[PDB]
DNA sequence: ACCTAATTAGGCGTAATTAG
DNA sequence: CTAATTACGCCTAATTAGGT
């Protein structure tokens, strides 16, 4: 345990992620690193986001 | 329990803050809360009750 | 009687957590 | 990792207790 509150993403970081979601919806470490760098977000947030998007796109349909 | 008071000046800063952003993000609420000196509850509540007033007549 | 600022219970997205 | 669930934050609108 080490505190983990919500973030809120903004259309910009979102758009950047969505743009990065194409090309590779399952990015390895480096790609997530530079995405974190481009966005400022914590790695885990990028990761959990991508997980969630994969889940979302598979969710339907 | 308060009824945590308002003061003119803070409220001045506040309607001044109302412009540019009808309903802001936590950054705004924070720095605003700092300039005011009251808890985020206090800020969000006023913003809310203003959110339930501007439309009340409009 | 006004003013307003606090709950109060409810619904909505979706990030974060958990099961598996 | 996936697939399902939970928790949070973020907003509403109708009360609920204040104040000069």
| CATH architecture type of chain A | Orthogonal Bundle
Largest sheet of chain A: none
CATH topology description of chain A: Arc Repressor Mutant, subunit A
| N-end to C-end Cα span of chain A | 36 Å
Question: Can you describe this structure?
Answer:
It is classed as transcription. Keywords: Dimer, transcription. The assembly is tetrameric. The structure is a homodimer. Chain A contains three helices and no strands. With 61 residues, chain A is an all-alpha fold. Chain A has one domain: Orthogonal Bundle (Arc Repressor Mutant, subunit A). The chains hardly touch. The structure holds a DNA duplex (20 and 20 nucleotides).
In short:
The structure is a homodimer. With 61 residues, chain A is mainly α. In chain A, 66% of the residues lie in helices and 0% in strands.
Properties at a glance:
homodimer, 61 residues, mainly alpha, Arc Repressor Mutant, subunit A, globular, DNA-binding
Write the layout of secondary structure elements.
The structure is a homodimer.
Chain A: H1 10-21, H2 29-39, H3 43-59
Chain B binds a DNA duplex (20 and 20 nucleotides) through residues 1-6, 23, 26, 41-42, 44-46, 48-49, 51-53.
């Amino acid at each position: 345990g080490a505190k983990r509150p919500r973030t809120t993403i903004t259309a910009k970081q979102l758009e950047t992620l969505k743009n990065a979601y194409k090309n590779s919806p399952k990015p390895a470490r480096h790609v997530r690193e530079q995405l974190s760098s481009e966005t400022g977000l914590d790695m885990r947030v990028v990761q959990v986001w991508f997980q969630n998007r994969r889940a979302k796109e598979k969710r339907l349909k």
